[PDB]
Design an enzyme around this catalytic site. Structure first.
Site, PDB file in Angstrom:
ATOM      1  N   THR A  44      25.160 -17.110  23.006  1.00 32.52           N
ATOM      2  CA  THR A  44      25.999 -17.267  24.072  1.00 32.52           C
ATOM      3  C   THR A  44      25.721 -18.289  24.863  1.00 32.52           C
ATOM      4  OG1 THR A  44      26.463 -14.847  23.764  1.00 32.52           O
ATOM      5  CG2 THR A  44      27.970 -16.065  25.216  1.00 32.52           C
ATOM      6  N   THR A  45      24.603 -18.093  25.238  1.00 33.03           N
ATOM      7  CA  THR A  45      24.166 -19.153  26.604  1.00 33.03           C
ATOM      8  C   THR A  45      24.092 -20.620  26.143  1.00 33.03           C
ATOM      9  OG1 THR A  45      22.738 -17.281  27.239  1.00 33.03           O
ATOM     10  CG2 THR A  45      22.070 -19.652  28.167  1.00 33.03           C
ATOM     11  N   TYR A 107      37.135  -9.604  20.217  1.00 38.37           N
ATOM     12  CA  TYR A 107      38.417  -9.976  20.487  1.00 38.37           C
ATOM     13  C   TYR A 107      39.196  -8.744  19.409  1.00 38.37           C
ATOM     14  CZ  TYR A 107      43.214 -12.095  20.945  1.00 38.37           C
ATOM     15  OH  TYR A 107      44.429 -12.563  20.954  1.00 38.37           O
ATOM     16  N   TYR A 133      23.705  -7.566  18.072  1.00 38.70           N
ATOM     17  CA  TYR A 133      23.847  -7.870  19.398  1.00 38.70           C
ATOM     18  C   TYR A 133      24.961  -7.166  19.886  1.00 38.70           C
ATOM     19  CZ  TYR A 133      24.738 -11.081  23.452  1.00 38.70           C
ATOM     20  OH  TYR A 133      25.249 -11.727  24.743  1.00 38.70           O
ATOM     21  N   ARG A 138      31.978  -8.656  26.844  1.00 35.14           N
ATOM     22  CA  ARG A 138      32.308 -10.057  26.435  1.00 35.14           C
ATOM     23  C   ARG A 138      33.180  -9.787  25.112  1.00 35.14           C
ATOM     24  NH1 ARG A 138      28.669 -13.705  29.478  1.00 35.14           N
ATOM     25  NH2 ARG A 138      29.431 -15.552  28.464  1.00 35.14           N
ATOM     26  N   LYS A 161      19.629  -6.382  20.299  1.00 32.64           N
ATOM     27  CA  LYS A 161      19.712  -7.079  21.623  1.00 32.64           C
ATOM     28  C   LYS A 161      20.592  -6.072  22.244  1.00 32.64           C
ATOM     29  CE  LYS A 161      20.960 -10.928  24.226  1.00 32.64           C
ATOM     30  NZ  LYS A 161      21.548 -12.115  24.320  1.00 32.64           N
ATOM     31  N   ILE A 203      15.627 -11.000  25.568  1.00 35.80           N
ATOM     32  CA  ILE A 203      16.217 -11.996  25.023  1.00 35.80           C
ATOM     33  C   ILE A 203      17.018 -12.591  26.327  1.00 35.80           C
ATOM     34  CG2 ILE A 203      18.122 -13.275  23.639  1.00 35.80           C
ATOM     35  CD1 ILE A 203      17.148 -11.541  21.261  1.00 35.80           C
TER      36      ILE A 203
END
Ligand SMILES: [K+]
Ligand SMILES: [K+]
Ligand SMILES: [K+]
Ligand SMILES: [K+]
EC number: 4.3.3.7
Lengths: 292, 292, 292, 292
Positions: A44-45, A107, A133, A138, A161, A203
């Site tokens: 994501t980052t 989503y 994850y 999000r 994670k 992480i």
């Protein structure tokens, strides 16, 4: 490995929004020197949302190549369509990466059964270790401990994670999985607490700019020296927090540019340049951590 | 128009998970006959998440073809990367669609400014009317009324499908925009209330199976006959709720298959088959509405 | 002391809704034998809401008398009017109680400054150790760590019972107070985790029916034997949870009656008798813990 | 009646914190002159929490006296113990009040059944009309529509002041009760929307300082002239919001003092004086509304 300070590395970009090799090489060297345990590429980052599959694969191969075996590379392979996730995973099957970081479909909000079915199929199409994850804020969905227990029985699924910031989950999951199952924090502000409860690492986003400290903090925590670990954590807390004063990775990319680790802080829409007050805030947290 | 009962149409698939033309053709004839105002092709209920851009384009094209001008078609064109959104929109530019339903970027969680930049960019590269789509439960982000006020100033952005279910939003948005800006409910269970407060219609999931009642209800509401509209809404309420007993479009696709509107209720992973418990709940709701 | 398994004891009642001395004596003996560290008399679980000030004081004196110095008694003294809190506190000034458990004002929702002013004045009217109590879900307000740090400077304020279930708060508060400041969990389901993070004990509801185990679990946790502590916690978890299957103290009072510790499970309105399914549920959790 | 703009009146106090008759007299004359439908004496805005039962009774009595029959008075009679509630109600039985505003038990968090038993008991011991009061943010519990449907069957229970701000509740309750059951908003910021959906009025905090505009707005709404009602609501919006910048009744008491309606803005602990920042925010809101 899948322990300690693993960095969710940013994808440095030129003024045009394309990966900047020089800046990426600098970051990788920095992590190799700072003692970072592993690198999660295009997570994501790392702006996995604005990079197409081809560009995504290019960044991973480049990172792998630049790492030159000095540090393990975990690739982000998440997708909200099961076929797509399997497809992206397969590009890396024999790439040299050590495992995949795969997020719960966002989503579309599948059921726990859907989540299970989703990860089971991905896992059946690769030999690479899969790290689940979960980041409900999000994605719109939450992978519950019971489902993790189910998935932990799949040989290929090796860890999770956890980014909920819900600390009671460390031991709820531990109670259901083997001691071999890896629990990584996905929230910097509570990573130490996560570790004190039984987690194995983090992480991290903070690790992008304070890699030495994060690695040290994690080793101490790992050796059970939580009291000294807290001292480092206290210095880093304003960073753990202000790095999200604006949509990640907006604050961390600027901090990186400011620190001289990347050439530019360019991002891809809908991510936008940091605000002035945003700058002031991050600069102060940097000061406080003693990096600036 | 962008008024009345607009169906967020399902994408019927065969046993293999491929789009089924015959069932689609049937659904379209059904809406033409029931009085549905328009069709939203490949939106969330149409499994946009599991259809690749090529399949997405073919489905929209098939729909236009089958619609044969008898009913307007709006295409879902949302993406969480601005460049991807612009490209997707360019593929429909002169296709014959009347507008695009574009969702706020999901997963990457952009700021109000990013959200603003995103939609402005999209609107700048097309001539099709844009309908903004806010559904925080699935995207992890929220398009506030004031941002909507800014965006509404862009010639091209003509309305919003509001799915928060937060009814104070109707007049908060209403007061910030032009009289001709369209407010559409995106939450079936609260759509009549939304219309009673000033909204113009609803982009409906319930309309997939109760197209006729929904069309009458919206017309009555538009005319100010809320008491008689409430009567219908009460019959439909169990369906408004039960169609979400399991992840949408799982319940509604089953319901279409049950009515004989579509051949199979097959979905793509991560969407899984309806459970037996789900079957009975939806069925009872269908009887309540007087459809079975 | 203010460490270990402190029980938030129920106020056993006869069929008429008045304190039952025989049943109270049995409970106190049970706690003395089971190794419970202290008794919090007339707290939330003890129905402080439905007992007037006089009856409240009567129950405390009786408990004190029946304890006969074999176990410390902490009195609930919370009120949402500062004058009232001071007034109730003063009845116990020289009663024999060891400290007071005082909750943040409920219903009226004061500011952090109001919270500060409120506890500061109470503390200035007594010599008794004051233990703050934060339970946002029942009070409508939340005492933040920063305010706790402020109040911890008042000599008389010695600790806090944290009932948010928000584990990150243990170390946020610890960072601001002295090591002498006592941190007690107010949530049974997460008390062990709370302790592993640095907490000193738990003001428990579960302890009403499983006092021996809770005391043992806390001693081990205290000695750093968290692994064996988890075994006891695992046996108790269904109890930690099902004891709230209905508005506390409805489930715990029935469990008590069932166990033969109190004569009747009578409560005062608005608390009502446990439901049948409620019984079945609690009975199973009892079975699982090996008490039934 | 129990229609229109009903003021949740503040309890003016002198420097010592004692009720100030002269200021109260002034406030009452103000509402008589402005067209306020009725007065709720000693409710949440009237500091019921910091007034003992004797002060509570005196204030209600003084108000009746000063009102001198020119405007109806409703007394706050809520308590979180059924017996206390019944007693409080008996002290007002033939006082001259038109009804009682009774809040759902706070802090002890009873079940829907307990809530039902509570109100039924109260209604059974009086002849005064009862108006239920739901405000989950302050009480920690929620009176659902279906429980309201049960309670509405009790002859005596005539209405509800709904303060969730959740507008779907209007028609959910409306459909479960009798045509003559009164629905009153308890949330100023969403009151016009609430009325537009079917409510009959609002028990207002804003009416303390903008009595005349509120009375006109509610009359327009009742007559269906929502457009012209919206105009006024827009002027008043900043006040609807700013009167809660700091814990109510802190901002509104200051505002009354500022207008010269009450002598002092003194409150009782845990309520503290308005901050300077609060002063400027409320003042600006007063100018916006055209009151200063
Ligand atoms: K495994
Ligand atoms: K426009
Ligand atoms: K102290
Ligand atoms: K009635």
């Amino acid at each position: 490995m899948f322990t300690g300070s693993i960095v969710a590395i940013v994808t440095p970009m030129d003024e045009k929004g394309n990966v900047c090799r020089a800046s990426l090489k600098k970051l990788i060297d920095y992590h190799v020197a700072s003692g970072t345990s592993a690198i999660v590429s295009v997570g994501t980052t790392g702006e996995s949302a604005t990079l197409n599959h081809d560009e995504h694969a290019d960044v991973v191969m480049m990172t792998l190549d630049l790492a030159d075996g000095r540090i393990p590379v975990i690739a982000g392979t998440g997708a909200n369509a099961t076929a797509e996730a399997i497809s992206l995973t397969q590009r890396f099957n024999d790439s040299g990466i050590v495992g995949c970081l795969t997020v719960t479909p966002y989503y579309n909000r599948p059921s726990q059964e859907g989540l299970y079915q989703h990860f089971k199929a991905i896992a059946e199409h690769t030999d690479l270790p899969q790290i689940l994850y979960n980041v409900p804020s999000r994605t719109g969905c939450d992978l519950l401990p019971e489902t993790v227990g189910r998935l932990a029985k799949v040989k290929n699924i090796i860890g999770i994670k956890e980014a909920t910031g819900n600390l009671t989950r460390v031991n709820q999951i531990k109670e259901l999985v083997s001691d071999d199952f890896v629990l990584l924090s996905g929230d910097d502000a509570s990573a130490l607490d996560f570790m004190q409860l039984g987690g194995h690492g983090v992480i991290s986003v903070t690790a992008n700019v304070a890699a030495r400290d994060m690695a040290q903090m994690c080793k101490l925590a790992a050796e059970g020296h939580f009291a000294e670990a807290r001292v480092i954590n206290q210095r880093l807390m304003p960073l753990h927090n202000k790095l999200f004063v604006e949509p990640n990775p907006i604050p961390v990319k600027w901090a990186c540019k400011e620190l001289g680790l990347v050439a530019t802080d360019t991002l891809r829409l809908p991510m936008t340049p940091i605000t002035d007050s945003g700058r002031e805030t991050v600069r102060a947290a940097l000061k406080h951590a003693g990096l600036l």
